Amino acid sequence: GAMDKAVGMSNDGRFLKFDIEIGRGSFKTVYKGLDTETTVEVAWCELQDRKLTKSERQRFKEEAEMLKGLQHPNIVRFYDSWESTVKGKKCIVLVTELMTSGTLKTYLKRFKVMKIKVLRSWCRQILKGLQFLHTRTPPIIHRDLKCDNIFITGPTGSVKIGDLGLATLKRASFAKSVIGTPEFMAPEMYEEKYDESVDVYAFGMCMLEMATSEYPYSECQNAAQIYRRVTSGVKPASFDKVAIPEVKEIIEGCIRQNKDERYSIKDLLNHAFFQEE
Numbered sequence: 688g689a690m691d692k693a694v695g696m697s698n699d700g701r702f703l704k705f706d707i708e709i710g711r712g713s714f715k716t717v718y719k720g721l722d723t724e725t726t727v728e729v730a731w732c733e734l735q736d737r738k739l740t741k742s743e744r745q746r747f748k749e750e751a752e753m754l755k756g757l758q759h760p761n762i763v764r765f766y767d768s769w770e771s772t773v774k775g776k777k778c779i780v781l782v783t784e785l786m787t788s789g790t791l792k793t794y795l796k797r798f799k800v801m802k803i804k805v806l807r808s809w810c811r812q813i814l815k816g817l818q819f820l821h822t823r824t825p826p827i828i829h830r831d832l833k834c835d836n837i838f839i840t841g842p843t844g845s846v847k848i849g850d851l852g853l854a855t856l857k858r859a860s861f862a863k864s865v866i867g868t869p870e871f872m873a874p875e876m877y878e879e880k881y882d883e884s885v886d887v888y889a890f891g892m893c894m895l896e897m898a899t900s901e902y903p904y905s906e907c908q909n910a911a912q913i914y915r916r917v918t919s920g921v922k923p924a925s926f927d928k929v930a931i932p933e934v935k936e937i938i939e940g941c942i943r944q945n946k947d948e949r950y951s952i953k954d955l956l957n958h959a960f961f962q963e964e
């Protein structure tokens with residue numbers, strides 16, 4: 688069967704690809720693969736864009752080297768990446784930990800609401816992962832945090848942050864200058880700046896999504912209206928639907944327009960909402 692047809696391999700024979708398509712987006716196709724060295728299944732991802740400039744691919748090679756030496760139990764593990772030659776163009780392959788239980792976003796669609804104990808636990812694990820990344824030397828900023836790339840190991844398991852280090856390549860992809868997902872992007876990111884606090888802003892919106900089970904700014908007609916609102920400090924309408932005042936208050940501190948007024952991650956971890964139990 689399916690697991691007997693290895694239709695691709697890394698140069699070393701470590702990773703094998705099976706013709707089992709497990710998902711597809713506009714950036715990436717994901718296939719089930721095998722790590723022959725540990726026997727664990729992995730996610731073998733193939734980038735849709737086969738016309739990235741030499742310079743884009745070179746920069747990503749340097750990025751993948753750093754990603755390959757980072758590990759934390761709340762971060763989806765990055766194993767390797769290389770360029771395969773498929774047809775007429777350089778197809779980039781990434782191999783990552785296989786996540787078998789979907790995302791926070793699909794969890795919210797399935798269960799409709801998140802219980803406040805589950806919220807607290809998962810938000811705390813996201814915060815530990817970000818805090819790990821922010822305290823490396825040098826610091827690593829994710830830049831593209833959202834509910835869609837936060838994975839779970841099971842409905843009562845643990846959270847892993849996905850897509851670390853792919854924001855530059857996602858921007859290059861199809862030469863479209865996509866900077867991120869408007870709903871989660873701090874105001875300063877449209878001026879081409881980022882610091883650690885963009886991740887605090889995005890964490891705040893993830894928390895807003897988990898507390899309300901709706902996408903932030905779903906009232907907005909398009910990304911332009913979101914841009915205008917965020918860069919004048921107009922909150923998403925869902926902020927007033929937040930039912931737990933402590934939660935509301937954390938979200939408020941995370942999404943402040945002025946980056947310097949936002950909570951630090953350490954502030955967040957010591958908050959009574961998280962520090963309790």
Ligand SMILES: Nc1ncnc2c1ncn2[C@@H]1O[C@H](COP(=O)(O)OP(=O)(O)NP(=O)(O)O)[C@@H](O)[C@H]1O
Nearest residue numbers: 709710711712713714715717730783784785786787
């Ligand atoms: N490590 C993983 N293990 C298993 N499935 C994954 C993994 N990473 C992504 N997927 C799934 O593969 C599908 C496509 O991934 P996704 O990240 O939506 O694609 P994308 O092209 O990067 N982004 P977008 O264009 O915004 O959809 C989604 O259903 C993901 O849940």
